[PDB]
Structures are given as C-alpha cells and as structure tokens.
Amino acid sequence: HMAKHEQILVLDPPSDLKFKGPFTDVVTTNLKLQNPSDRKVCFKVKTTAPRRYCVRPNSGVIDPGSIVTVSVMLQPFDYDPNEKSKHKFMVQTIFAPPNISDMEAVWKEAKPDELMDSKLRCVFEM
C-alpha cells in the first residue's frame, strides 16, 4: 500500500552512526531525534543485531518541538578479519492520534501505512 507520510522526525546524525575503536570496551554514539511537528510522535528503535547493541531509550513519545537523545552502545568484541558485518539501525515512528488514551494503544491499533521509517548505517572505524 501507499505510506500516508514521509518521516516527520529529524535525526542527527541523519544517515550514519559512527563507532570509533578500540572496541575492547563499550563504545557509545548518540542519535538525537527532534519532532518539528505540532503533533505527538511515538518512536521505536530497532537494529539488525540486538545482541551487539544496547539502546536507551529504545522507545518513547516526543512532544511537539521536543528533542530526545538516544544512546547507542556497541558491545565490546574482538576484531575478526573474516567477519563481514553491515549492521543497520531503524527509527520507526507513528503520529499519536490526538484522542488516544495511552501509548500502547498507538502501536496496537496502528496500520502499516501509518508507520514512518528511517534507516541508519553502522560504521566501525579503527
């Protein structure tokens, strides 16, 4: 089907999440989400490799004009030249109906065409 809207949230960084080594300990990079609309927007952060990342907060609601900082923590790991990881992060969002009574209901009653997605590439720099 046809998506109802393009992504409303503004992301910083907009496309790539860079993690600088060494990776002997947890390496964290931030992702700021800003809501320029006059409506409340709910979000969920997802990844292609959950075991290698910890995200906080991984979901929430952003009020009109507000901004939230998401901490993305890459878990320590031993570099393997034989590994070819191309991890991606996704910020999935949805407008909260103005008359809805709780956040859980926003996602429970959501239709596919009401979702907005943004993808970020994870880059590991030595």
UniProtKB/Swiss-Prot annotation:
Record-listed N6-acetyllysine modification sites: 119
GO biological process, one term: neuron projection development
Keywords attached to this entry: Acetylation, Cell junction, Cell membrane, Coiled coil, Disulfide bond, Endoplasmic reticulum, Membrane, Nucleus, Phosphoprotein, Tight junction, Transmembrane, Transmembrane helix
Impact noted for substituting residue 88 to D: Loss of interaction with OSBPL1A
Membrane topology classification: Single-pass type IV membrane protein
Compartments where located: Endoplasmic reticulum membrane; Cell membrane; Cell junction, Tight junction; Nucleus membrane
Region (phosphorylated FFAT motif binding): 44-47
Domain MSP: from-to ranges: 8-125
Family in the record: Belongs to the VAMP-associated protein (VAP) (TC 9.B.17) family.
Self-association and partners: Homodimer; disulfide-linked. Heterodimer with VAPB. Interacts with VAMP1, VAMP2, STX1A, BET1, SEC22C and with the C-terminal domain of OCLN. Interacts (via MSP domain) with OSBPL1A (via FFAT motif). Interacts (via MSP domain) with ZFYVE27; may retain ZFYVE27 in the endoplasmic reticulum and regulate its function in cell projections formation. Interacts with OSBP. Interacts (via C-terminus) with RSAD2/viperin (via C-terminus). Interacts with IFITM3. Interacts with OSBPL3 (phosphorylated form). Interacts with KIF5A in a ZFYVE27-dependent manner.
UniProt function note: Endoplasmic reticulum (ER)-anchored protein that mediates the formation of contact sites between the ER and endosomes via interaction with FFAT motif-containing proteins such as STARD3 or WDR44. STARD3-VAPA interaction enables cholesterol transfer from the ER to endosomes. Via interaction with WDR44 participates in neosynthesized protein export. In addition, recruited to the plasma membrane through OSBPL3 binding. The OSBPL3-VAPA complex stimulates RRAS signaling which in turn attenuates integrin beta-1 (ITGB1) activation at the cell surface. With OSBPL3, may regulate ER morphology.
Protein name per Swiss-Prot or TrEMBL: Vesicle-associated membrane protein-associated protein A
Species of the source: Rattus norvegicus
Gene name of the encoded protein: Vapa
